[PDB]
Structure 1
Amino acid sequence: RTVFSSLTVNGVDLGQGVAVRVPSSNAPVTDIESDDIICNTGFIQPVSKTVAAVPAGGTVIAHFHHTSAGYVGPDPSDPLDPTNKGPVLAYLAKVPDATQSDVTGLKWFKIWQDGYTPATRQWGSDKLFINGGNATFTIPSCLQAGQYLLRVESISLLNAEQYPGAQFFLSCGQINITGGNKVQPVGVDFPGAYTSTDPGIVTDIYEVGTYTPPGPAVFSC
C-alpha cells in the first residue's frame, strides 16, 4: 500500500498535500473500469486549490509514502511494502482547470514509467523504495502550456495472477505547465486504457520473464 501525496518542482518542495488530491487512505483501487482508476477516490478535504507552476522540461518528484499522511518517521513499508513488486507510471492530461472536480473524459498520455529489468530482476517498485518514495521524471519540453492533471501510479502485482488482483495506488497532481511549445499529444481514456487482458495487469510475478507495463507507449517530444 502506498499514496502519492506531495510534489517537488525543480528542487522546491511544495508541502504535504499541496497541489495533490490525496485519497483518505492507502486502500488500493482494484476496478480498472471504475472512475476511481482516473484519480482515486475519497479525497482529504478540503482539496488543495494550488496548481503548481512547472516549466515544460522541468523536473518533478511525485512523493509516495506508505500512508496518506506522508512522512511520519521510520516504517519498513514506507514508501511501500517492497514485497509488492510492480511498475510505477506517470501520465498527464490537459484539463480546462486543474482544480475542476470532474476528471472524466480526459485524454491521458504517458510521460514516464519504470517497469521491470529481467537481467537484474528489479522492478520500478524496488527503485521507488530505494528512492524513498521519490518518483522523479521530467515534463516533456514541447508541450502546449496550460493546466494539466498529473496522474502518478504504483501498481502492486503481488496478487495479480487473476483479475481482479492488481492493486492500483495513484493520485492526481494539479499543475500549470509554463513555457513549452505547441505539442498536444494523443492520449488514452481512463477508464478504458487498462483492460483485464493486459499482461501488464494480469501477471504472476513468480513466473515473470519479461514484463511490459499497461497502457500506451511513453510519449516523447
Structure 2
Amino acid sequence: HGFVQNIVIDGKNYGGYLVNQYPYMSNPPEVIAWSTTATDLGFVDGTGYQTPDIICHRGAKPGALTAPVSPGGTVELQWTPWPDSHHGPVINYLAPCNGDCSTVDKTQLEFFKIAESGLINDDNPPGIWASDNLIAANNSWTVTIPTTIAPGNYVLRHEIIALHSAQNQDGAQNYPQCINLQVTGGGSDNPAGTLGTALYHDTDPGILINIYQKLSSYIIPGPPLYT
C-alpha cells in the first residue's frame, strides 16, 4: 500500500496526487499527476484488469498540468515508504496524448513499455525484486525518457505489482500511478501500443505465481519492451 507523493524533473518538485488529502478537499489543486479514488492506498487486482481502473488506477482522471522533460531526461517518482513484503516488478509505460493530456479519454490510450525491472536475485526466496531496489533507493524510481520516440505530450504510467499474495487467482496487486509529460527532442518512433485493458491477464506467468518458492526465471508481465 502506497502512492507517488512527488516527482522530481529538471531540478524542481512537481507535487503528486496526494490520495490521502486531495479527495477530502473538494476544491483540490492542479497537478501533473492523475486524480484517483484509491483512498485506501490500495491496488487494482486481476478482477479489474479489463476495467478502466487498471489504466491509471481506480476512478482516475487526467492531471490538469503537464511537466516538460529535457531530451533523454530523468523523471524521479518518489513513493510513500514501500513495504518490504510487497515484492514485485516496477514497470514504466508511455502513451501519446496527441494533444493536451488533461483532455484525453484514458480508455483509448495505447501504451508502450519503456522500462521493466523484475526479480533481481533469488538467493533467499522470496528474493530481491525491483520493489526492493525502489526501497533501497529510499522509495524512489528513476525513469529515463527515450530519445528515439516522437516528442509530444504523453501519459507516463508508472507501476509496482506486489506479488506477496499472487499464488491465488486475482491475488497480484497492481499500483499504477500516471503523470502528464511533455517529451522534447528530435526522435521519430511511434511504437506499437497496447490498450490499458490488454496489458495484463489474471493468469499471466508473472501475475499468478508463488514467489515464496525458488524461482528459476520471472516473466515480467505486460507487452514487449520497446527499444
- 1:68-107 equivalences under 5 Å are 78=81, 80-96=82-98, 97-107=100-110
Change (3 A) 1:114 1:10: farther
- 1:115-194 equivalences under 5 Å are 115-118=118-121, 121-194=127-200
2:101 match: secondary structure: coil
Q: Distance in 2 between matches of 1:119 and 1:197?
A: 22
In structure 1, runs of 5+ residues without a counterpart are 66-77
Q: Which moved more, 1:4-13 or 1:166-175?
A: 4-13
Q: Quote the offset at 1:104 in angstroms.
A: 0.7
Paired AA for residue 218 in structure 1: L
Q: Are 1:195 and 2:201 matched, yes or no?
A: yes
Structure in which a larger fraction of residues adopt helix? 2
Identity within the alignment, %: 32
Query: How many residues get paired?
Result: 205
8 A contact 2:5–2:15 mirrored in 1: no
Q: Distance in 2 between matches of 1:180 and 1:3?
A: 33
Q: Quote the offset at 1:119 in angstroms.
A: 5.0
Q: 2:54 aligns with which of 37, 47, 54?
A: 37
Q: 1:63 aligns with which of 78, 85, 98?
A: 78
Q: 1:27 aligns with which of 42, 46, 56?
A: 42
Over the residues paired in the alignment, what is the CA RMSD in angstroms? 1.8
8 A contact 2:71–2:147 mirrored in 1: yes
In structure 2, runs of 5+ residues without a counterpart are 18-30
Offset from partner CA, 1:80-120 (integer Å, 9 cap, x none)? 11111101111000013211252012210111122112355
Q: Which moved more, 1:112-121 or 1:162-171?
A: 112-121
Q: Quote the offset at 1:35 in angstroms.
A: 0.9
Q: Distance in 2 between matches of 1:178 and 1:117?
A: 32
Q: Are 1:4 and 2:19 matched, yes or no?
A: no
8 A contact 1:56–1:142 mirrored in 2: no
8 A contact 2:53–2:60 mirrored in 1: no
Q: Distance in 2 between matches of 1:134 and 1:217?
A: 24
Moved over 3 A (4+): none
Change (3 A) 1:28 1:208: farther
2:54 match: secondary structure: helix
1:128 match: secondary structure: helix
